[PDB]
């Protein structure tokens, strides 16, 4: 399971981030960390250097101490108090005098639970402290932001990532080509949770890891096919298209949200004019609405590729 | 009762998925089973290589140890744990390590009861294993697909389908022409439980299997029949339309909710275009609408036949 | 009441049926009944078969046997299983091997109920035997029809249901006219429960059965009052087809539906184009969906009346 | 409270219905009675003939036997049974065969729970008999209709009511007029219950019945204020019209429907051409549906007044 | 709290409803009370006469017999039913035979609970009386205006209200204008409590009771700063209209609620077309759905001003 | 964490609402406290005021009496009940008669809890004291308004917050320019927690606070970026446009109704035609609402950037 067995272990192992580790560095050197607020997009380390973190601070110990939790299951912020009173009297065994506990999806409860925190900051910040996960800053309450140094995760880039994935196959025996791991990119939206994930899947299976066998194992279809498939609809293939979007929604079985995404990217990847872009991504903003409020995937989206069938002359 | 008459034995015996079934036998020498995630369209094999791989591996004794149920029924996944204890401190009797429970209808529950199978995976790996099925892998919260090797079960094809029904038919005796074949396979959607049942239900009838038996006992006009009542009903003929609709309503006997199924099909399968056929499913949305809530079934009908008639000019 | 003093006592005696029963008499030479399902419109003969089918096997002694029961009150399917096992121990007293169980409105239940079926099927096939009542067939879900034969009840036709009826009548002193007769089946819909009942209704009061007197005792307009109605209101005349539409509907005292299901009859058997009979069905299928909502009768009817007074020119 | 001082007595004393009453009689010779069905509008008499016939069939001692209750009251029907089964067991004391129950709103019911009606009929038609009251007879299911003699009641009429609302009166120290008359019946819709309720309120006050005090107690406006209202509006004055209608919607205090209601009846008998009647009554039909679904009371009406205020040139 | 210091004593002190009380004081002279039914807008006076109707009955001992509660809680009506045999069984203590029990919101229960009132009205009629305040009479089902004496109360009119205004001011030192007396009248909408606490409000602030200060006090734009934002929105000039509502809602500090509320009123108060007010109040009616919602208050709100600046030509 | 450190310490320190302070200083000479409401956006200075009202009519003693809660936590009005009778029976310790409890967010409550304030108002108004605070008094239901002296609060000022923000710099040693503190300001929609605590996390980095640092920190564009974004989608550069929404929401990491409120400020404070300016807020309001359905946020977005790039010709 690749994307544990590559957990970083040193905040000098999570990649992409200086912006964040350069000074997250600068917390280690005097042993201070106010509570901690993690804001960024999913997959991107949050909880690695929360992990990499506690674990350059506690050295062999932080297992012990640290523990992740996840904040939005409502009835357990007060259930899981009693490992705040047991925590916070146990004095880091060693010689350091502050615990930590991480808190992910912070960003998924109303003004009320989020209070709860400050009774444990003020009384616990000589014996404990927090680090929380949000994808937005904005969205938590600011009394909070208040007692918190704050930090934005930035999706991680290309090059980084690929150096990392590649890094996890030849200490695991895997061989991808270059097809495969630029597909395997195209997947991972930046994200590497994703990214990770996938790759431990292919490896899984029989030996090379073709750009094919990337894409079949997350079911999101080749951007050749995409740009094929927008493309016969714009001549005014219509029923060819229909045909393309079934097939390929079966290959991969992809939802209606899915395929609507990956409509978007390859809409936006096109070569044609600013002009004629926008009149399909208007559409497709107005199609991926109809699908949100629960009308008939299979409808809506024969229905857009009706829309652009329309553009011929 | 066919279709479990023919439920597959070992996975050499589950037809059309090479692609799975080919890696899913790289589990049987070796007798390793992580838990795994069966996606694909329903009636193409995911219950039957969950069995004929719980067979393959226990031999004889496969019914005393791995059981199906319905992931769906919200308040068993924790009535349905104390199966879960007595399974797993029962070691495979004869000279395998580990155990299996089949999932059916994964993909409906909520984030929450997700989780509830993580405290059975890390704890039960070395007793117990899960077997997910599910209509789309997008549909599985990630911290699950990350436990999971993946399949992906696509819908089983004409010839394959076709050859296998038969062997149904000459091994019970049943008389099917060509024409009640190929309409059976209209029928099916390339879903075996719907076309093997179906299959079953002709059989158990007077003897020879037409085209027509099945189109009746799935409740289910010649789609030459609809493409005629849509078009003569588009070209401005509605009494003649009103007419066919009601013989071709009498004839098989079909509910409102059948007919505007059926209308559906052959209004996406018209090779008409994409501008006009957003016109006739949006006013079959209406239609169908009006019907479940419980409007006159004639009224309606004949009232999209009228819809239709309009757009003559 | 009539319907029941003539209920028919052997197969040979249900009319109209011939495709089913001439079929269904081939399982009463070789006592073969493998579990029935039984569709059609009401009024038609289900129950009336399923009666005449136990009584032509038994004989003299169904009473004590067959029992009749509605499907669709949903706590008693359970409560109604202790009658399943006396039922099942005790033996066909007399000569034959199996027993029979009528279930009307069994398309009424969604999944769950159904299934309880099939575990009194395989291990009640030596012993007790189904018969399925249903509107439709495509209602009620495959693995039941799986192990069904199946039979689908046309709407009894002309000829067969008058020649019953003047059987009802001759044998109980009533004088029906042909004009009565013709109408008694207007009413009918070609369904017998409908025809017997008003007949019965018709007979209970003075003597001679004009074609009046039932249309009187089915709340149903004159044909010819109705297509005038629509015609003053074709014309121009509002304010008279207003009129007319009252005294109609207190002559009769009929419903909203039921004025509605008249004006759709007359509107589709009117001799006018089909280009306008259209605009007429559309509309009336739009006033339908309007009253099942709750609007209200008096101003969407009125409102109707107004709909085709503007049709002038 | 004169709507029930004078409950008529015996079947000769329910006006207007000579239709269904001179029939009835024809039950009390015989001491006949099978399950009867009446139908009709309310507030003419349903209720007071089935007292009027358990009246003038066990003389003195009706109150002990018969027994009303409103049948769409859901819970009740089974548990109102043990009045069924000492009301079964208890023989008419005097030298009668039968017994009474009065079901009121039967046609409220699901197809369900009229099913339980029947295992007492058949086991009761030596004992027990329903009167079954219901709006339509449409609206009964036939399985019903057939056990039924039935009787539709007409709308009274105005003279038999007339006459009794003066009985009242005299016999009550009430000084109507003529003008008090005629506007008690305007009022009443042909309903006694509602004609004699009004009279009543009307008599607590003040000495004279005048046309007005009458329609004031029922704040249903007087029918020259709409047609003052409704006329201001296709004048062209809107402001005037919606001050009208906010005075008239208080000092009477009618509901959306109420007013939209007599907004009809005075748009009807209007004196104004069959070409505009329509336009109007179309339009009201609209507004009345916007109302039953639930949208502004307050916003459609006063839209509807602007509706009229188009139509000046 | 003023609304309550001058609570009406005696039904001569019930103001503006000389309609209900000169009739309702000739329950005092005989002391009847059939049930009474209180009608009308809130704020009317149905709580005051009811009180001041047990106080003119009692003389002192009014509080220990009569009881006020909220019709609407709706497991509560059956766990007050032990205050109805503790009050039916005590007498009058003094020298009358009867006693009373409100029963404000009447017209929010189903028809269920309703019944429960009539087994304490025959047989407590020697004992026990109810007064049932409800909006509107419509909503109260027939079998209980059956046993009401009905009082359809007013909205309070202007120079009764003002009146009775000033009389609280000169008795309690607060100097209110004329300006602001006119104004506490456009507030009230003709409803004392809302009239009376705006007052009490404005009372305990700093002296002089301005126009302003009862607007202020209310949240509430002068209706002429509306009819000049709406107009000059409506003229073309977005940006002033937006800068307007601006300095509009933070002048008086107003929710979006209460902005749309006023924009409503003033909207239905302008003397422009019924033709395009619909159109307006449309738009509105979808305004504060978005609102409801939750999407946001300003965005909406300017993008409403929009939707005004599009109907200039 | 100067939002503190700076918190008013007399009335007169409280800035922008003189409206309110000078007349809520007309309360301290007097020493009269009549139950307090506030009124007003957040971060205007309502704790703060009813801090430095407390403050400065106990002197030293504040802390002692004086206690802060949040209302909106549901369980806890009637835990912190005994808090009020403690601080009922103790008197202000000094020479003063009166003391204060202040209520945040009160108008989160629905009608009930609101009562409960009510039986310790005239039975602690010569001990206990309410200050309430609340975003719109519209939303107090109108029983406490009745007690209560109102005080609207009204979004501070531009140079009056900018000049303490220069003290709280000044004394602490933070170089602003005036860039970042214009900028800063844009932040703070002239709320000051927003505002300090943003300074403070900017003064905690490298020295010198651009306008860049500020903008940085609270994830909120630089105003210049937004009007070159619209700009260029309006232009018609549509991929462009994307390109720059994109690196814009990733360089702060925004939300969609973070970014969907800066689009709007900035299409406000546009120097373009009021015209057009309404076709953008109101396509805008749609936007908005989309998102709040939830559908998707980077297509809805690159949705509207394509709807401005059509208003090009």
Known sequence: IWVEKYRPRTLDEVVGQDEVI???KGYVERKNIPHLLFSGPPGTGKTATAIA?????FGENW???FIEMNASDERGIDVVRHKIKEFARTAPIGGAPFKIIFLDEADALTADAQAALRRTMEMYSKSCRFILSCNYVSRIIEPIQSRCA???FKPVPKEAMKKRLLEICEKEGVKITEDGLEALIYISGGDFRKAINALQGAAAIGEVVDADTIYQITATARPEEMTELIQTALKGNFMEARELLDRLMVEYGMSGEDIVAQLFREI????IKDSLK????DKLGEVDFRL????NERIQLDAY???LSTLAK
């Not at 936006?268 to 070569?271: G, L, Q």
């Open 292 to 295: 949100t409020e629960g009308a």
């Open 305 to 307: 590729l009706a829309y």
């Open 53 to 57: 973190l506690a674990r350059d601070l």
């Open 278 to 281: 926008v009149q399909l991504i």
């Open 63 to 65: 297992r012990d101490n």
């Open 268 to 271: 936006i990847s096109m070569p």
């Open 22 to 24: 350069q000074r997250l």
């Open 150 to 152: 704050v930090f934005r």
